[PDB]
Amino acid sequence: PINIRRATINDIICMQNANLHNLPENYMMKYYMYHILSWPEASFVATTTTLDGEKLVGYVLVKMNDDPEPPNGHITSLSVMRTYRRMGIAENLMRQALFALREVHQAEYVSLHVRQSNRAALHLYRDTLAFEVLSIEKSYYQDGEDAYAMKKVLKLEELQISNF
Amino acid sequence: SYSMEH
Amino acid sequence: AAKIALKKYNQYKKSLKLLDAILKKDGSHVDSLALKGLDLYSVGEKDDAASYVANAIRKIESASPICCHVLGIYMRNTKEYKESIKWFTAALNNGSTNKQIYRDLATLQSQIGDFKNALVSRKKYWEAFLGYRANWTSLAVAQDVNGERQQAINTLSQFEKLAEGKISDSEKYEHSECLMYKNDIMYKAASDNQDKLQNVLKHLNDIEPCVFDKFGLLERKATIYMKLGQLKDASIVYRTLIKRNPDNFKYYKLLEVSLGIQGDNKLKKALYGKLEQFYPRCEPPKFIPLTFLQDKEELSKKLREYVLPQLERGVPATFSNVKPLYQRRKSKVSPLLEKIVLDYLSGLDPTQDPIPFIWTNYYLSQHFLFLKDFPKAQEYIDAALDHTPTLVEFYILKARILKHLGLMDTAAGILEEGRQLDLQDRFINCKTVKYFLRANNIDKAVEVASLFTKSVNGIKDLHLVEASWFIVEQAEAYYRLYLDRKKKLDDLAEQIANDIKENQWLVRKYKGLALKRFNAIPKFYKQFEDDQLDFHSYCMRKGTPRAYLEMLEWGKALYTKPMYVRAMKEASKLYFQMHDDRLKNKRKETEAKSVAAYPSDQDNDVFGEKLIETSTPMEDFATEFYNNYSMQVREDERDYILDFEFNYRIGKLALCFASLNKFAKRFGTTSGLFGSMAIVLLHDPILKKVVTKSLEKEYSENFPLNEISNNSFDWLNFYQEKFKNDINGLLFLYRYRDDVPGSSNLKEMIISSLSPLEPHSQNEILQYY
Amino acid sequence: RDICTLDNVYANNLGMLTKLAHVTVPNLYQDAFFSALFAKDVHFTQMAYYSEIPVGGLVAKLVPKELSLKGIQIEFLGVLPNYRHKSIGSKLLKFAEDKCSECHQHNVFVYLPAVDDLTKQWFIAHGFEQVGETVNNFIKGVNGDEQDAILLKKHI
Numbered sequence A: 001p002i003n004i005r006r007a008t009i010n011d012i013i014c015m016q017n018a019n020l021h022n023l024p025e026n027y028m029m030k031y032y033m034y035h036i037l038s039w040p041e042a043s044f045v046a047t048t049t050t051l052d053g054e055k056l057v058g059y060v061l062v063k064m065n066d067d068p069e070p071p072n073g074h075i076t077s078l079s080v081m082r083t084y085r086r087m088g089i090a091e092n093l094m095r096q097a098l099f100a101l102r103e104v105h106q107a108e109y110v111s112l113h114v115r116q117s118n119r120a121a122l123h124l125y126r127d128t129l130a131f132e133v134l135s136i137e138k139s140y141y142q143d144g145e146d147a148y149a150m151k152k153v154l155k156l157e158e159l160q161i162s163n164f
Numbered sequence B: 001s002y003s004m005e006h
Numbered sequence C: 001a002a003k004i005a006l007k008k009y010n011q012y013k014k015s016l017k018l019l020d021a022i023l024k025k026d027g028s029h030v031d032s033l034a035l036k037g038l039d040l041y042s043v044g045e046k047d048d049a050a051s052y053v054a055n056a057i058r059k060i061e062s063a064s065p066i067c068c069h070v071l072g073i074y075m076r077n078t079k080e081y082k083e084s085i086k087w088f089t090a091a092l093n094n095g096s097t098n099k100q101i102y103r104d105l106a107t108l109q110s111q112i113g114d115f116k117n118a119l120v121s122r123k124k125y126w127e128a129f130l131g132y133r134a135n136w137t138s139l140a141v142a143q144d145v146n147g148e149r150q151q152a153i154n155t156l157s158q159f160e161k162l163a164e165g166k167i168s169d170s171e172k173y174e175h176s177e178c179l180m181y182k183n184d185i186m187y188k189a190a191s192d193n194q195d196k197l198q199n200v201l202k203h204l205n206d207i208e209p210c211v212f213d214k215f216g217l218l219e220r221k222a223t224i225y226m227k228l229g230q231l232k233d234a235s236i237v238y239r240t241l242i243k244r245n246p247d248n249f250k251y252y253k254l255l256e257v258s259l260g261i262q263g264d265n266k267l268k269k270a271l272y273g274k275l276e277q278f279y280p281r282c283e284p285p286k287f288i289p290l291t292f293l294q295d296k297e298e299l300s301k302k303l304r305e306y307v308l309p310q311l312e313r314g315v316p317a318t319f320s321n322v323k324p325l326y327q328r329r330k331s332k333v334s335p336l337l338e339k340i341v342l343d344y345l346s347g348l349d350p351t352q353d354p355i356p357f358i359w360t361n362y363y364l365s366q367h368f369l370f371l372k373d374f375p376k377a378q379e380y381i382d383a384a385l386d387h388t389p390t391l392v393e394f395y396i397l398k399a400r401i402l403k404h405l406g407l408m409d410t411a412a413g414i415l416e417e418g419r420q421l422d423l424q425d426r427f428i429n430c431k432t433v434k435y436f437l438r439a440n441n442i443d444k445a446v447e448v449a450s451l452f453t454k455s456v457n458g459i460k461d462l463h464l465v466e467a468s469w470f471i472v473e474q475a476e477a478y479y480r481l482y483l484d485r486k487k488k489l490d491d492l493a494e495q496i497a498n499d500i501k502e503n504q505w506l507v508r509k510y511k512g513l514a515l516k517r518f519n520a521i522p523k524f525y526k527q528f529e530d531d532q533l534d535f536h537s538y539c540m541r542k543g544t545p546r547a548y549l550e551m552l553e554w555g556k557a558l559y560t561k562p563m564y565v566r567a568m569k570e571a572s573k574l575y576f577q578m579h580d581d582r583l584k585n586k587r588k589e590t591e592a593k594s595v596a597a598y599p600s601d602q603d604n605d606v607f608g609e610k611l612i613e614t615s616t617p618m619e620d621f622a623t624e625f626y627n628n629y630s631m632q633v634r635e636d637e638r639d640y641i642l643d644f645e646f647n648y649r650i651g652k653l654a655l656c657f658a659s660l661n662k663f664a665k666r667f668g669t670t671s672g673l674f675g676s677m678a679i680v681l682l683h684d685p686i687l688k689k690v691v692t693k694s695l696e697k698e699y700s701e702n703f704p705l706n707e708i709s710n711n712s713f714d715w716l717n718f719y720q721e722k723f724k725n726d727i728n729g730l731l732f733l734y735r736y737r738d739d740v741p742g743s744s745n746l747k748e749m750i751i752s753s754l755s756p757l758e759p760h761s762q763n764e765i766l767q768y769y
Numbered sequence D: 001r002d003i004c005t006l007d008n009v010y011a012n013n014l015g016m017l018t019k020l021a022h023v024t025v026p027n028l029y030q031d032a033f034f035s036a037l038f039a040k041d042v043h044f045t046q047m048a049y050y051s052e053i054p055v056g057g058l059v060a061k062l063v064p065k066e067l068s069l070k071g072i073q074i075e076f077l078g079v080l081p082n083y084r085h086k087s088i089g090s091k092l093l094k095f096a097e098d099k100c101s102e103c104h105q106h107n108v109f110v111y112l113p114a115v116d117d118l119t120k121q122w123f124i125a126h127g128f129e130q131v132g133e134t135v136n137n138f139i140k141g142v143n144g145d146e147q148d149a150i151l152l153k154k155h156i
């Protein structure tokens, strides 16, 4: 039973261990100690909930306009342990990640790079969430693949953490 | 899945 | 003249003209030598860099202040912190103007522990840059560390007052992860004192509009409101915080005490109904209130009404969304539960409702892996897999099973045929290449998993991507693919004498490689903490200390994290054995792209030729490995069994007694290993009576130390007279088979007493152990 | 969407068709040929997944120029047991016989084996007929067995 936490820095070793087991994105341990030590509030992680530690099961890292211009939000990488998916998990760990990405820092437009080649992502990621497209960047991925951009406007009241 | 190579 | 060189980067090819020219008449002078080397590191060659930096430290003792700082800007980069403080101080107490040195240093001697003399040498910058709030934190982050919170809490409320009645968009994130953080400190003095708190609550009530964390405050408000006996006012904050992310329990269970109704089940079970009605079908409402119940009439209602539905849809955690209630409370659940499932597999005509027969089998072929009925765990999985063969989540359950009954090889096959079900999506592409590394199959592990890892193989590009899942899995191959290759040159006693000289290589090529492999697992942690450097004084521009005050407190307990641990203990049992053994080339140049770790610069010892046999693996296992994790490790979490081997295999032992002891005040003397870890120390120089004496000082009465000296009393039986099935504690006595001489008595009463054990493991302690 | 959808069999899949072969059409097609579908003759494919998780299969060629057996062949077409039954892989023909007039091709060939009267008295009930007669030592699985074939046809 996945619990949806607020992501701590303790969970960088166990976070990045998942976006690597389950993803073709090799990332360093700096580029986690600055997502979660610049804008640590709006990047969420969620996995295992046992009482009477925890196991990583799925996470969500979300940086802002790192590079230089009206307060733009981004989302770096997202994944989940297979034997856990299709049970929300992914599908409502982001309705909070946006629902803080315009509450704390207050940024008006999300953004990202989803491959596809891809069902899971380029579906409840433009039909559930609604997130147009913008530039379809070709070979912008490290496999000769071409991957959708995805913009996603966010105006507070029209995306709260309890519409379900 | 932001690409730090490219 | 070098001014145009020193400016030529902060790539300082201009500095060459100095080492071409400045090395004209007068040669042996600093300043010019030092750029030539700071460049080297900001220019590839590190080897050739010190032959300058160090060939210029033999013309000083202080030196050209302006130049001591192009030397300390490298020491701060060749990891050498302690020594850098000096190269800087050697500017300051030599007349340097660059008064930003009191903040290039204070973000160094702050890391290397010295937090006392961190503030004194940081506040001293704060005066020359006092129009920059990203400094007015470190005079209240270091003060807040040192332990004077009022000098912290007052240095930032003399910010919140200055600067202006003005906070534009630049600082629009400043007055949040900040003038809220103040409340984390300005309340963590009260502790449980009513004198403050109300105000620390009324202050937290003041900002709200200015506090921009929305969450993350509710706790120093919505639990300070609970800390003064007003159970409401907070039960009305958690009731609005549960409603903020009800997919998380943390804030939900508390609310049971928020409404004082902890031990009142009767309203408790009903509380999560007027709930469920509110916040519809999100885990908590339903789950939590089935972990505190007692009625084979009630329980089987909310049990069934939670389960079945997930089946009819096809959920892989249809089980692992309950694989918790099967652990901390079986007997009561896994009876009602075992009977509320199969009892639903009667109208699943596999030609009417199929996405039910296929998945209400990979639950039973998961449920009957707990009971370990195994026989009835390859039935459902297989019979499930003999209906839909295109559901990679059966092969995993077949390769967890089949692999928990030993057959390690055969298991990864049922996984390979799962991998081939989909090339892309490394969701199994590793898992398939995990098991084929747990069967020693390191070859169709590298290929079969290098496919999505960018040379001439994978395991090379997976070091510059962290990946400490793989190494400390690729050594738990090699380390097990050695005690058998090294069961050849100890078994025999043309191709028979020539064959010894082949299979008795790989013992060198793995024990060599397998230890060389674990050093990469440490080194990362060495450099995980050694990359929290630029963040001391550039997490402050961001204005994120609340989060940052968790990084320092993550740093000390970094060396005691998950993967540093199993990478110690699974290394000890390889280092510890090279210090109780010394006492008592074309294949190398042609197979060097299949076991390559790093660039041809660093790793000069391909197969750890040195690592394989070092003058004293004691001041290696401590400098490389251990004596860092022993400096940090917290007390009530430190393996004492390892601790009592480390100070024993060195010489100490004096410490073995004040190490075997503190293992007792955890278990309580009648545990397994504490018996064996006493026995061994039955009785180094004469002046090592003292062990026996102290061993006989307290622990004389219980258990016993009075036939130790005399050839008696075949204590194999006594050693196990508490009480045979301590197989944790038996193995010990043999591991060291030399100061615990009877040797062909224990192997049976170790072997013959693992029957009621798990097969994969029952036949693991064999062959190798 | 209904229950039984489909898609094109992207070379990331394939192995869910090799598995959906060697089960549907046991002992037919070599253990590397399918990899040899995308590695001059044009060869169609389509993995027909149902509900969510795959449950059928079809991957057929396209012959043009000697007359008699021109158009689109049917290298295999099958779907797993206790499925086909429910129309999960009757519809692939409509998305294969489509490829005939939709790609311009009068006929469609389907070389079913001889015994398979269950298959040969069913495929007949869709728009096919025993064009010609029996054969002789023609079908031979990657093992060493051999059988006769039965042919078929349908114009448009």
Ligand SMILES: CC(=O)SCCNC(=O)CCNC(=O)[C@H](O)C(C)(C)COP(=O)(O)OP(=O)(O)OC[C@H]1O[C@@H](n2cnc3c(N)ncnc32)[C@H](O)[C@@H]1OP(=O)(O)O
Binding pocket: D024, D025, D028, D074, D075, D076, D077, D078, D079, D080, D081, D082, D083, D084, D085, D086, D087, D088, D089, D090, D091, D111, D112, D113, D116, D119, D122, D125
């Ligand atoms: C070697 C080669 O190149 S090709 C190899 C050919 N394949 C083989 O030899 C083995 C094939 N294995 C099989 O399982 C099957 O025979 C298949 C896949 C070829 C065909 O099976 P299906 O998809 O069941 O056929 P389909 O779905 O059209 O219908 C079967 C019958 O059920 C009926 N039906 C259709 N939908 C439904 C439904 N929802 N409920 C009940 N009955 C239905 C049809 O009317 C049909 O009736 P008929 O047999 O009297 O005409």
Ligand SMILES: Nc1nc2c(ncn2[C@@H]2O[C@H](COP(=O)(O)OP(=O)(O)O)[C@@H](OP(=O)(O)OP(=O)(O)O)[C@H]2O)c(=O)[nH]1
Binding pocket: A055, C323, C369, C370, C400, C401
């Ligand atoms: N989280 C995780 N677990 C893994 C991985 N590889 C294998 N496992 C399995 O996880 C189990 C390890 O124990 P736990 O960590 O207690 O499992 P838990 O997460 O379900 O509590 C083993 O049994 P098991 O196969 O799960 O069988 P069973 O114990 O479920 O019957 C092991 O085979 C992995 O990469 N990640």
